[PDB]
Symmetry: C3
Subunit: 652 residues, 3 copies
């Protein structure tokens, strides 16, 4: 069996949806067109329901037929473990219902892995489709018992060391361990019968469900990390014209989770929402190209579309498909085929992509999400007083930097390497990360002391990991920030922070923060209040502005001032060595990468007008390698059309 | 035959030749005085109303010892008889005071026995009054909240499932849904109403049996009218402006009432029908879309129903309830027990009937030959696919009824009659469908059996117009668009894609720079036998298939819903007229062009043709009437309408009846 | 000391005590509180922070706070707050079980026996914020109490005439249940302490007044309190009318108190981060506005929640008057100016009596209960929703506030109907949809004896059993000299245009038409009878059955309601009471007396400087208090946006 690595040739692929009633002729037509569309890979849901017989034996014939037709057309298979479940369950169950159900799953894995491991075109086991859910089954006996046991094996006090009341987030910490346990158990079950094939899983809805996911632990039992990134389910925090930024952030979040493992996008939107989806669309040909290039530029080893062909009955019947109802290519399959073709014509370049890290990392943590859920009591009013502000704030910084043509990491705090000796020219952004503990504050102190730049806005560090506010009891970040909060005062959803000397008018959301400096240099507003500071801490710097300016940019639909302020704070080396825009461009993105020593840039225009983007930083002259609407450059000034995707190769 | 007439006895038996009546609920509860009740019947008689409806509350007849005391209702029946008023009597067993509408099914076997006792006592006693006109078996059968929680319903559903044999796969092997709940609910309504009819018939074989289905644009998926015909003498209805017409603005409650009348008329088949429950007065705290009907609306509603073959209009209510829910609400009389402008208006229509008995007793709607068809299964599949979302678009509950109602409105604004029928109420057995038209607008579920009926209809000369997602699914929510399109033969074409767009977009045709409003989804197709119609992007968006002697126009984008969303039915009117057989436009009075917020429907009585015209626009309108034969004589006009040679000048809110000389 | 109507008013604040705090921090709070001219604190006596593993009471945490209070001469309102979940911000409202009741008995014995011995204890707060919108009918203690209550009451399903009725068993039980538990808490305290004032803070009064029988509570309290939070309780108003909200809230509690002194136990002292329904941080200007409104309405105190903040989870670092460095915010600086004014003006400030115009706006429990039945709990913000029966009288209250006229805001049973003469008195019944025969006889007596009755909206449409006498035989026909004909629903906002006086009154939702017998009819420009004036003995009735107070609310314009109401007031009210020469949008005035001297409070909530011409009563304006340099010329006051002014009337 071929094993995926960081040097593998990336593929374009699609789900092949197999259910009873389909003909041999139909299935062959799908694999034939898939191969002709420069796709090398499919994913097949190994439905337990469609292998169980009246007598209780396993009949594999429906899936044998599909695997053999895949093999005939040289198509490799991602096989999803999908035990018997109700027909109406579109995504699959996330945990066993009962001990008896766990034994049924054991039997399912034994039978399916023992049989299908023998196909030479099997590429990977997907341990479970879309682990995690917003509706965790605390009602069910299996989960209820595991939670009770977990609480008894943990030793939590109702008071902290100083004597203050605390919350312990038992449910949230259990759910992390429970996901770790079930996925590790699935991996162990597969490994009883198959030690040869890659193990894979697709975390999903990552801007909501990241607080369920411990990716560093998952690395210990996976060969590759996957993902679902659907425009109609996962990108609700963005308008459609910023699905570029959404896909880039989603790719960066999975890339960070993968660490040293290769990653790929297991499940992308291939087609139309009729009745399905939260934010329904039919992707354009232009969007298909945008999403494949964004993922490959972010080190993806594959993009698999849900779905090649459609389900026929009830939920999503005739929805999501890349082929039309005559089983011929839509403009989406034609577009995807151009990217498969580009890969086959550019194998060495496309097999060795490394993202060009600017040195900017936007960090989120589980605990800011968990504390926010407790403090907002689950309200969904779309503001800072609602679920989602702790992810929308860092995503807004991410957007501002994308609109400056700067790459940024999007990482859980535990995925950041705090162990190095030197952080000169590195930048951490902590945007409205409302919960930080003493351990992470020491890591941030070390980072800044060793030359790091820390940017913090909104309610970053207002609470610890027990929802205890050190702002009230004795501020844990006083040392690092060289300053102390004074007040928060609630204002309107959108207000202006007007700096002394007109240096900036920053859009701000909901709360105005005021501070008192000791060691830091104060920054005053036109009302004579202290609204920000710069602290020199060892060899590094802190910029702290306790009003939500990233959320202010989001609310005002204008990232230009956040871009300008952030650029002014970046170490010179980042702007000298990284291709970026000469200024902020609304609804344009760029991210750069390297392959075998050569530098490349990806540029996408999501504005309504032709844009001329002046690219500066790094070295070399633009050669346009890919441009789907005949972009042209004059010196390093790129003229790019609405919805166009461009790859520049930088020569000498 | 002559055995039915010996059974009939002294009691009136309603027929398609009965003189229509205007009537009102007489609300009887304890605490009212003899003098008050007499005042109501006296004013009802003086208002040219011949008929009342009375709720025979079990609660107000049950005594401490469990005997029935009939005194309260005897008093009312005797005062009705004194003023020559006939009574529709509603069976309404003991129930909580707070239950405004009544329970829809028994709670338990024990409760069923209490209902049996109630029917025995009440029917045995009140059947003896010579002024009893009908038994209403149950008030407003059906509900949006069916009691699956209660033991009687839970057990009936379990038994039903055991007596049906469903597979999880179809003949070709594909997964299926069987809609067990929905099919049970049809059979459950059939069972309980048939049981109530059988219970009444134990004690009274003389009097008409009646029932009032309600909220028909939402609850039609509960109702099997063809089966109900087997135990009713007349079909009724509730059609309340404040409860049932939420899919329409108030200025189109004309169209809402016309469609509601057409839906019940279709359900009635060979039975006579009447409107059992119309809104007679004001909403204070009650209703979803609260109003107080204008005098003009009362006249509009009575004429629309009569023009659609109604044998009566009964207003809820003559007098008001006094305590809690609807206290001092809904009444046609004011708090001094005198006439509101609504009762004065209703009285003019009672007077017209007495002065025009032979005309008004023999109304037959002039069928254009256009039938707008809905089916239970499109509603059931929509409820499964939208997961019950209430966002008011194609991705929500209601689109499968709003789409056909939009075609209905376009035709109303062209002055053309159209039937509104459940697919099983359409007669597919004829040899010739020349000059007949079926509109299937976003009827998302069609099975092989109905497709064969449609093939036969078109082959034999029928015109079929299909828009939106018509035929996307079968009756098991299986999409033949995915597995092998069941309408390919009839349509001479095959779907290619749907692509979701905004709530309102334009279909921009290749030719004439022609534009159609469309809702939510753009459909593209590939033609084999059909003639393709292309858009400016070079995609095929519609086709005409010539199939035997008939034709099919198929446009798989929702253009009826596009007209609804744009609040403009003018293009849908023009397109539909262009597809009609010439004989329909030659033989039927209609407007020379589309008129926004005007309606006309035509009818015949004893060989003479008539037209009803209502102006709901803000301005005086001059409507040029063409088609059929004759010269306009204005027989009814409440605001001094005048005509010059078939051009009618009609005022805002005016109702006009033209007699064609 | 024992509170009385002659006590010197205080400014005070919650001192929030929880484990983890240092001696040094707590001392810093009491020191700054004393330096801020505050004499009083309130402390939540958390059972959770006194219970030991063995079940003994350890009082240490609260001893430390009481001793530091005493050192700085700060008196303590001590809230009885038995052991409860850390997540319970407000406290439980009733015992969960008989066993829980015994735990509460033990808690009261221990806490009252111990803390009664501190010389700086001022009052026991029997329970924090009695009442809740979500009553625990599910729990055994309440389930049993409701069963017993129903067995001891005998309700019929029909009235005397034979009509069906509702009996509102749940609502009547809840009144008796609140009365019982608060009386029981008072009796428990009195087992161990007969020396200290008993106090309680009813809250969210524009929603929860239907839970509260203040006349009964007087029998076991020494003072009535209140919570009046801008972020929880004033949702029926925009922020610019929180002046009117606070004035009405003060008037409602003042009416409930009767002969007892009252004070505001719980005002908003600081910022909402994640908490509150209508979140804000009060301005310095709002702090001053709220203290003066309450004192002008006879309040003996204003206590802010909170001096210092909670540290963990719910409201962590929220609500506090001090900043995160434990120094004064502009809110504490503002409150300190009012504490200073009181110390410099003790005799004036100790003897405030509100100058009653003679106008009383009456609400009743039963209108709220019948509305909840008729609207089925709908929250659509119109007359067909929960709240219209309180928003209607509050709208009249606002119209009068914008005329500079004081008005009482009273439950109907708090009005004294026993007097011989009501000459120059006015009752306004605005959309009080339920009235019974007993209250109608009291209103007949009131009008006969010289009273003026103003009724709008659906006042008297129903009786106390939700039976409409409008349907069966109108109970108010005698008093009104007229009979309803119809209601017809219209749009959310329409205009009632009088034939004669060219009043054009905004009206909400329903148009009422009537027929006059003895009354003089008032016709509109459509030729319909929409109102009447009935002469009844020495008094008069103005009846307009369309909602004109709710019309003013919906149009955001109280000017026409002001003009119409002024035209109906007895001359003596306009001659003897300071008021505005005309309607002023977003300005309020209320007047008071102390030791024979008359004063006026004026607040400008408009965006612009206003010049208000004050007329009525006697004397020349002297500005005694002004936070933005107001000036007067004769009796014409120039007042800045957000400014609070006290005029002393000299002659
Ligand atoms: O909703 C479309 C897709 C997506 O959710 C993924 C996976 O869950 C697949 O089963 C669904 O059909
Ligand atoms: O809501 C008004 C009417 C209507 O529902 C019909 C019937 O149910 C009657 O009982 C109601 O009073
Ligand atoms: O929410 C703010 C306040 C207020 O409700 C009062 C009291 O209940 C206190 O406990 C709260 O902290
Ligand atoms: Cl799968
Ligand atoms: Cl009835
Ligand atoms: Cl407290």
């Amino acid at each position: 069996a071929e094993r995926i690595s960081k040097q593998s040739t990336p593929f374009v692929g699609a789900q092949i949806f197999i259910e009873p009633g389909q003909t041999q002729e139909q299935i062959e037509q799908w694999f034939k067109l898939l191969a002709e569309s420069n796709m090398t890979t499919c994913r097949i849901r190994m439905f337990g329901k469609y292998m169980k017989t009246p007598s209780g034996t396993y009949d594999f014939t429906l899936f044998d037929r599909a695997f053999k037709l895949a093999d005939k057309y040289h198509i490799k298979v991602y096989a999803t473990l999908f035990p018997d479940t109700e027909f109406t369950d579109v995504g699959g169950f996330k945990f066993p219902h009962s001990r008896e159900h766990q034994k049924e799953v054991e039997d399912y894995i034994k039978n399916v892995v023992s049989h299908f491991s023998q196909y030479k075109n099997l590429a990977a086991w997907v341990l479970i489709n879309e682990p995690g859910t917003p509706n965790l089954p605390f009602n069910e006996p299996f989960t209820k018992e595991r939670f009770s046991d977990w609480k008894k094996e943990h030793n939590f006090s109702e008071y902290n060391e100083k004597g203050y009341p605390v919350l312990n987030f038992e449910k949230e910490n259990f759910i992390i361990d429970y996901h770790n346990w079930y996925l590790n158990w699935l991996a162990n079950q597969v490994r009883l019968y198959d030690k040869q094939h890659d193990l894979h899983v697709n975390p999903h809805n990552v801007f909501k469900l990241s607080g369920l996911y411990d990716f560093p632990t998952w690395r210990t039992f996976l060969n590759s990390l996957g993902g679902s990134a659907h425009a109609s389910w996962h990108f609700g925090y963005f308008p459609r014209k910023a699905y570029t930024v959404a896909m880039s952030a989603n790719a960066e979040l999975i890339r960070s989770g993968a660490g040293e493992l290769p990653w790929l996008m297991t499940e992308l939107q291939g087609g139309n929402n009729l009745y399905s989806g939260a934010n329904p669309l039919c992707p354009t040909a232009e969007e298909i190209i945008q999403w494949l290039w964004i993922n490959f530029a972010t080190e993806a080893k594959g993009g698999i579309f849900w779905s090649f062909n459609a389900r026929s009955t009830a939920a999503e019947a005739g929805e999501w498909a890349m082929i039309n109802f005559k089983n011929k290519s839509s403009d989406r399959l034609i577009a995807a085929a151009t990217i498969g073709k580009f890969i086959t014509e550019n194998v060495k370049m496309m097999s060795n992509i490394k993202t060009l890290n600017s040195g900017i990392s936007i960090l989120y943590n589980h605990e800011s999400m968990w504390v926010e859920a407790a403090q907002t009591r689950g309200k969904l009013n779309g503001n800072g007083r609602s679920i989602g502000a702790v992810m929308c704030s860092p995503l807004s910084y991410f957007e501002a930097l994308s609109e400056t043509g700067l790459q940024a990491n999007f990482k859980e705090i535990k995925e950041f390497d705090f162990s190095l000796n030197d952080y000169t020219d590195q930048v951490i952004i902590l945007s409205h990360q409302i919960a930080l503990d003493n351990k992470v504050i020491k890591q941030l102190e070390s980072f800044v002391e060793k030359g790091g730049t820390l940017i913090a806005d909104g309610l970053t560090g207002y609470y610890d990991y027990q929802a205890h506010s050190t702002v009230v009891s004795g501020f844990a970040l006083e040392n690092l920030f060289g300053s102390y909060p004074i007040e928060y005062k609630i204002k309107e959803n959108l207000f202006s922070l007007d700096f002394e000397k007109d240096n900036y008018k920053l859009p701000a959301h909901l709360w105005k923060g005021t501070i008192e400096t000791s060691k830091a240099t104060p920054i005053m507003d036109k009302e004579g209040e202290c609204i920000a500071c710069i602290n020199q801490y060892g060899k590094g710097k802190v910029f702290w502005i306790p009003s939500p300016i990233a959320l202010g940019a989001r609310e005002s639909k204008d990232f230009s001032e956040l871009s300008k302020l952030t650029v002014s704070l970046l170490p010179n080396k980042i702007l000298n060595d990284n291709p970026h825009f000469d200024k902020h461009y609304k609804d344009v993105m760029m991210k750069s990468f390297k392959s075998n020593g050569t530098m490349y840039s990806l540029i996408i225009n999501k504005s309504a007008s032709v844009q001329t983007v002046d690219i500066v930083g790094g070295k070399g002259k633009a050669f346009i390698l890919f441009a789907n609407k005949n972009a042209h450059s004059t010196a390093n000034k790129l003229t790019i059309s609405p919805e166009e995707t461009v790859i520049i190769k930088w020569k000498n």
